[PDB]
Write a protein that binds this ligand. Sequence first.
Ligand code: CLA
Ligand code: CLA
Ligand code: CLA
Ligand SMILES: C=Cc1c(C)c2cc3nc(c4c5[nH]c(cc6nc(cc1[nH]2)C(C)=C6CC)c(C)c5C(=O)[C@@H]4C(=O)OC)[C@@H](CCC(=O)OC/C=C(\C)CCC[C@H](C)CCC[C@H](C)CCCC(C)C)[C@@H]3C
Ligand SMILES: CCCCCCCCCCCCCCCC(=O)OC[C@H](CO[C@@H]1O[C@H](CS(=O)(=O)O)[C@@H](O)[C@H](O)[C@H]1O)OC(=O)CCCCCCCCCCCCCCC
Ligand SMILES: CCCCCCCCCCCCCCCC(=O)OC[C@H](CO[C@@H]1O[C@H](CS(=O)(=O)O)[C@@H](O)[C@H](O)[C@H]1O)OC(=O)CCCCCCCCCCCCCCC
Ligand SMILES: CCCCCCCCCCCCCCCC(=O)OC[C@H](COP(=O)(O)OC[C@@H](O)CO)OC(=O)CCCCCCCCCCCCCCC
Ligand code: HEC
Ligand SMILES: CCCCCCCS[C@@H]1O[C@H](CO)[C@@H](O)[C@H](O)[C@H]1O
Ligand code: OEX
Ligand SMILES: [Cl-]
Lengths: 243, 97, 334, 33, 151, 167, 98, 30, 137, 96
Amino acid sequence: TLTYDDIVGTGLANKCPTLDDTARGAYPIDSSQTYRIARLCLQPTTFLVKEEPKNKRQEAEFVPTKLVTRETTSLDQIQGELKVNSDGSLTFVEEDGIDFQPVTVQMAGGERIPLLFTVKNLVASTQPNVTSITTSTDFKGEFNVPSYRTANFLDPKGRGLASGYDSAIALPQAKEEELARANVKRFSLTKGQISLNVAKVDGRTGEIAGTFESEQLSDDDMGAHEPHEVKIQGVFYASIEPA
Amino acid sequence: IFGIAFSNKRWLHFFMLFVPVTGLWMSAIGVVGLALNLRSYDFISQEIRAAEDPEFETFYTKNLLLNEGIRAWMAPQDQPHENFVFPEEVLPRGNAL
Amino acid sequence: ANLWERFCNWVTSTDNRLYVGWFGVIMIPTLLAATICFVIAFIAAPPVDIDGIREPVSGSLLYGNNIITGAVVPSSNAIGLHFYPIWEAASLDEWLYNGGPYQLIIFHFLLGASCYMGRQWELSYRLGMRPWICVAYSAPLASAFAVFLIYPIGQGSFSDGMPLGISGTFNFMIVFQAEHNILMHPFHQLGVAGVFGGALFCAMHGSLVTSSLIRETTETESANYGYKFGQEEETYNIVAAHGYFGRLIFQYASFNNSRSLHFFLAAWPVVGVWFAALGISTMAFNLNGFNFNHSVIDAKGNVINTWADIINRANLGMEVMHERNAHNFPLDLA
Amino acid sequence: MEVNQLGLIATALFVLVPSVFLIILYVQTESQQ
Amino acid sequence: KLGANVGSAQGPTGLGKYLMRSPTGEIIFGGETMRFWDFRGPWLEPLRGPNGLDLNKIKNDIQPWQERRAAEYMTHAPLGSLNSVGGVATEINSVNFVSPRSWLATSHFVLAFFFLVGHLWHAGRARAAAAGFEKGIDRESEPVLSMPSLD
Amino acid sequence: AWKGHAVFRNKEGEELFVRRMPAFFESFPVILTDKNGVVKADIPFRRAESKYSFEQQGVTVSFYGGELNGQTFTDPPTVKSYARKAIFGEIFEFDTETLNSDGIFRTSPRGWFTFAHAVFALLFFFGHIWHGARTLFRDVFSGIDPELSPEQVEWGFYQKVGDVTTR
Amino acid sequence: GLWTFIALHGAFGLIGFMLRQFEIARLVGVRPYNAIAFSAPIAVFVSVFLIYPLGQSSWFFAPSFGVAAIFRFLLFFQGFHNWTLNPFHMMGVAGVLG
Amino acid sequence: METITYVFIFACIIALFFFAIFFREPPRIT
Amino acid sequence: AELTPEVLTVPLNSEGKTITLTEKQYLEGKRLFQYACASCHVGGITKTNPSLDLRTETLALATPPRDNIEGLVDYMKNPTTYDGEQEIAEVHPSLRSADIFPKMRNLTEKDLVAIAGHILVEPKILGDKWGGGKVYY
Amino acid sequence: LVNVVDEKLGTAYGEKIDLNNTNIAAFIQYRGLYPTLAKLIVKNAPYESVEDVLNIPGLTERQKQILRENLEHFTVTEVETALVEGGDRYNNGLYK
Ligand code: CLA
Ligand code: CLA
Ligand code: CLA
Ligand SMILES: C=Cc1c(C)c2cc3nc(c4c5[nH]c(cc6nc(cc1[nH]2)C(C)=C6CC)c(C)c5C(=O)[C@@H]4C(=O)OC)[C@@H](CCC(=O)OC/C=C(\C)CCC[C@H](C)CCC[C@H](C)CCCC(C)C)[C@@H]3C
Ligand SMILES: CCCCCCCCCCCCCCCC(=O)OC[C@H](CO[C@@H]1O[C@H](CS(=O)(=O)O)[C@@H](O)[C@H](O)[C@H]1O)OC(=O)CCCCCCCCCCCCCCC
Ligand SMILES: CCCCCCCCCCCCCCCC(=O)OC[C@H](CO[C@@H]1O[C@H](CS(=O)(=O)O)[C@@H](O)[C@H](O)[C@H]1O)OC(=O)CCCCCCCCCCCCCCC
Ligand SMILES: CCCCCCCCCCCCCCCC(=O)OC[C@H](COP(=O)(O)OC[C@@H](O)CO)OC(=O)CCCCCCCCCCCCCCC
Ligand code: HEC
Ligand SMILES: CCCCCCCS[C@@H]1O[C@H](CO)[C@@H](O)[C@H](O)[C@H]1O
Ligand code: OEX
Ligand SMILES: [Cl-]
């Protein structure tokens, strides 16, 4: 068992536990029992940004990006109730955890795309009649993506939403209309979707692991510009336990 | 050591006169400008860009934020005859501080 | 004459147009690295997240800066004092986002400039000179260490190192005043006496020597042609300059001895700037300027403001506005 | 960046007129015997 | 204590208001003190797990002595004026405090610096004296005169 | 055109007055007082402990004279726009398109004349010093006497400085 | 009243000192470059203590004669004038540090 | 355009360094 | 202006009885306050919890009321949260916790009264400055 | 294009303690609310109406009296995302 001193500085702190490849088991669900996800960990491995066509009538594609904000990306220590529904399906309801990370990725050409990689208020459900979590279980769900900056954030000219100037003070007699979009900060709240594909199950320990794909919007800089669509792929780990 | 050197003593000592004297005279001219508030306050291109583009930040815009702080926080006590009453809510402040 | 001996002779040769020397062997590559990286970064580096809050600051010309606003931006606060060479980054893009060029430049530069000092000693020794010009240079050098290295060490982050830019310099000064009240620090004050005084004595000496140039030229020619490089006789009358200056003040405030005069000219600004450097270096450990905030109190206990209190109001403006998004807790403890 | 476009010519002339002055003075100094 | 979920509290920048990741992933304190995550201390280490600050330990295991110690140390930060007014430079007079750490560090930086200068002084002089020209250039034997011109 | 005189009132119907910008300030907060100088409304920086916001105080603006004569605005954003203009004094409609105006104040010919002439006056002081020196010291312009006797410049030799007849 | 007292007697005192430089130079037989050099402190004094407030609303905004008072003057010039950004100040800094 | 200007002026200064150092008037002892 | 008996007269209890401090008491209160409290409460704010200050209005709205000598002396013996619901001696200096806050050990009853007196008098002198924080520095 | 925080200042939020939006420090304004009830109240938000605050599970009788005594100081308005995200109801970046 590793300690903080074994791990510190290595990059391992940003990685999710994996399960052995022997873990193709089945974790039984007792529909009379209440369950809990004690730790949900999401480690992103790829960030794709949807390119934005000119003709708008072709197909938009997801291009690969370069991560520039280092090993600061994983969500972890997420916990929440795991409910058994009438139809035998399971629903994870996220209560709390380190469930967001600002991430900046960079596109070819140098454009930086900041996003709040998150599963805040994740509600995720399985197919009906899950008598056991298995390597064919998958969760699909929605989550909230709050504004990348929160209300106190001040832009470089000191304008903000809950604080700051409400005008471009360096241009005292400029016509204000042209600057409205930059002067008036807006707080977005959007939704994201995620799929968790369970690939490994330790039925003995209630541990599962797999891969995930999530989709969400990136930073809109408080309404100053359009966000990009981001697809995030990675691996996840979860420990289930009876509650 | 340095590539170039004095070779003329008279020029050396004249230069020692010239440099600080000229510097002080230049600063004087600038202050004569400030007498009329004819300042070097802004770079207009920077302000246009920054007004339109809230992700654009330089040390110049950072310093303006500092100046704005100085003005608001020091003006009422520094200029008592103006009777500036600046309620707490109008004082420019970053987060927490 | 074997190859190592030949190489050593060339390195320490007093015939090279620019002296190389052993210090130069370190100096040249480090200064070249610092210089090249600095030029490239100043022109073309993308914005840098100096304060580690994913708020990149644009420093380069191509990204909307002019000569005055431009800078190589200090490495990220998330890095702190961590060593961040290129090979510690997953990519150059990462390295640039996080302000790696700053670290490369200031470490190569500090090494280089230290070796420059060493090199001054070294050539002085090869030429049969007295050794202490390098000691004079230690004052600006120590200053560079103070703002590029010591202050970051004390504050725990190169993100608080002086930026490599004009407006960045001003930023550093203003924030320094907010956080340390450097104006009220006697070492900075001694620094100001050092450079004001040095400027004064510079003009003084210049003007006195110029005033007593011995006539060797006609009015249509530069008086400078009256001195010839390597001539054995002095080109001005120090006795006349002394008679003048002595009468300007009183006789015993004037130097008749050129050696002691020139020593004074060396010592004053060097010592002054040493104190300036020590000011920055000790405020690096938060031993700050004099605090007389609310020092004067009347009979009832009313605060009677002094100029120190007005200074404090300005300082508060700087403090509350600086790094407006970087603080979550009420005290700025570094 | 919306710079003032006259800046360009203002800078060019600022560099060129006095530089040229110096160059003239220097070259005719060299050509004197 | 007031009911905040500190693990999920997003600060104004998007970084966690209380907790964030170090560049290598360790869970660390947020705000400017992100620079100080290398810090280790007896009052803090019980909250530390393999991945850094452990959110369960934070939620459940913070003892009063830790709260005390943190309050004390926070209010005795090594910041103070030369006339020993404790606190940030903008603080009012009241607390007569400069940390022993500031005194010791500043004193010994100054001393170390001047002793480096003394080293330059005396090493340069020792070299000059050993070689025989610490009192100046011999007029009849000026080395540079025996040297080829640089150009 | 003159837009007309802005009169600000709060919900209680008190007339409020915008604090005018002093010439010293590139920027200035928007603060409204009553006739007695008591702060009655403002545009807050931090909203979370705001007490004097136009929205809380129900600030309106009515125009008298000028192009907006007879009109009253009550929506906070508009009222605030006009208050912002009101720190500059009387409010005008400007054509900013024709010259592609940038919205930043420039000085008048009074300013430029004054600047140019104070600066030239100051530089010409130096001219006076230089040429006066040249006039009075013409004899030593190329340097001092090669045969300057040390005793003329040393103390006590002459009773009167620089007067050889007083040895 | 002491402020104008000091500023004005100070102005004429500086005039007197430069006249003294000229006078002694003339008696001793040296060129008057020391006086000429002293024109720079006089330009600084006159521009900062006289012209600057004369352009402003009143003497109030001149520098006050005191250590901390002058520090305030510095900080004021940063906050209100952005004086560090001024190329004339920059040239002054080059002259002094140089 | 500004960038080109800034860098050009800078480049001229470096060139000037080169000439001032290597193609200086030789100091000649007399 | 001077430090009059009027200024030095403060509520003794919630019943409206008042007590008049001596100048010596007030100054002692100031010294003791600097000694044991000012590291967190300099100027009547609270550094480790800025939401609660030492303004008399804040003290008056506390539970039980702390805007009088007895309330403050009781607080220095057995501090509670603002609503009176919890005893916080374990994290706040007090006579009850003088073992873990050693500076409270050499404080006597007389001292607690002086400190209380200082806390009540100071806002009568400094007005907004007391508990106002940096805005009023 | 509207600043929603300024807008909310024009509602009852700008007059009273909004149980759905207001930062928890506000509860210091009245006797008995901070920190215990204030915590309970912010934790169990949002509320459709003010008197719903009396339905919080676990409340002692004392606490209900205090609440009833303060209902006039309370209001509710629609939850404003900008005010409740970031954990800003627990710490909105304002100290002294
Ligand atoms: C790198 C740091 C640096 C440097 C080197 C300078 C340099 C300068 N500053 Mg700048 N300054 C800086 C940073 C710097 N500044 C910063 C960051 C700010 C904030 C914006 C300022 C704000 C500032 C202001 C507001 C002013 C300056 C001015 C100056 C110039 C002052 C020249 C002078 O010696 O006047 C000294 C004064 C005189 C020479 C007048 C004559 C003095 C007489 C002769 C004294 C005789 C007295 C007699 C002997 C009796 C003594 C009595 C004794 C008991 C005390 C000089 C160019 C001044 C200026 O530009 O003037 C035009 C000015 O007003 N600076
Ligand atoms: C004079 C030659 C010289 C020196 C001293 C340096 C020094 C440095 N380079 Mg630079 N560099 C150079 C030339 C030099 N460079 C050249 C020519 C290039 C182009 C290829 C570069 C390209 C370059 C890049 C791209 C980077 C550096 C970086 C660095 C820093 C880290 C180096 C390191 O980790 O080595 C480790 C040290 C060793 C391998 C030597 C130690 C060996 C001794 C024997 C043992 C230890 C004893 C100790 C050193 C004490 C010696 C004292 C002495 C008096 C005896 C350091 C400031 C990095 C940087 O700036 O980080 C921010 C970085 O990213 N360099
Ligand atoms: C290792 C050095 C050192 C350090 C870190 C300390 C630290 C301290 N001393 Mg101690 N002390 C020391 C040496 C030291 N002292 C020495 C040598 C003496 C004999 C004079 C004393 C006698 C002494 C007494 C009597 C007292 C202290 C006190 C204190 C405390 C308050 C300091 C203060 O307010 O200073 C004020 C700050 C200054 C005076 C700054 C001085 C600046 C100097 C003069 C600059 C000199 C720089 C350099 C050496 C000169 C170079 C010139 C160049 C041309 C070469 C602080 C913990 C006080 C205390 O609290 O005790 C419990 C106290 O009452 N000290
Ligand atoms: C603040 C910086 C500073 C000071 C204090 C200063 C002081 C001095 N400069 C002098 C000289 C010079 N300074 C010169 C170049 C420079 N001088 C510079 C900066 C300064 N020079 C700089 C930066 C330069 C570079 C160009 C030269 C070339 C000279 C001289 O030749 C001369 C000298 O002799 O040096 C050895 C002396 C003039 C004596 C005199 O006029 O008596 C008469 C006294 C009078 C007329 C009273 C003046 C009253 C003043 C103007 C107003 C009142 C001031 C208060 C009394 C004090 C206020 C203090 C507060 C502000 C803290 C004096 C020692
Ligand atoms: C992006 C990557 C960029 C890569 C750049 C790498 C460049 C490498 C190629 C170098 C080619 C030659 C260039 C040097 C020419 C030269 O110096 O000759 C001048 C003399 C002549 O050399 C003399 O040469 C003589 C032979 S001959 O006469 O030249 O034929 C010989 O006899 C004599 O001993 C010798 O000293 O050289 C010397 O004086 C000794 C070496 C001096 C080198 C100084 C380097 C200083 C660098 C400072 C770093 C900071 C600069 C920042 C900007 C201000
Ligand atoms: C109660 C207090 C207890 C004690 C406390 C001690 C405090 C420290 C005291 C310091 C005393 C220093 C004595 C140094 C003597 C010396 O250096 O002689 C070296 C020369 C020799 O003098 C020359 O002397 C010569 C003869 S001989 O060499 O001395 O033998 C002679 O030839 C020549 O004409 C004459 O000029 O003296 C000088 O020429 C310099 C004159 C001015 C002194 C400058 C000192 C350094 C500059 C000041 C530093 C800046 C400070 C402010 C910064 C902003
Ligand atoms: C290892 C290498 C380390 C050094 C490498 C870099 C050295 C560069 C040195 C400057 C060379 C250019 C000098 C030209 C001018 C030149 O050749 O001067 C040569 C001149 C020689 O003087 P003399 O006494 O020989 O001249 C007497 C007669 O000519 C008078 O008419 O030297 C001086 O005048 C010294 C004073 C000016 C020195 C100015 C130095 C300024 C520093 C540079 C500042 C600008 C930088 C801006 C950056 C954007
Ligand atoms: C920091 C470690 C402190 C020291 C030292 C002292 N106090 Fe304190 N005080 C502190 C905190 C964090 C709080 C808030 C406690 C809570 O959660 O309620 C307080 C509170 C008080 C109060 C109540 C304030 C009010 O009701 O408005 C009082 C009256 C008080 N403190 C007084 C006090 C005195 C007299 C002290 C010195 C003996 C003292 N405190 C020390 C933090 C700290
Ligand atoms: C939402 C804006 C409604 C009120 C109109 C703004 C105040 S007035 C406005 O000010 C401009 C300068 O900014 C002028 O260019 C323009 O002529 C004028 O109409
Ligand atoms: O990083 Mn640059 O500046 Ca030295 O304090 Mn803290 O940190 Mn930030 O705040 Mn203030
Ligand atoms: Cl923080």
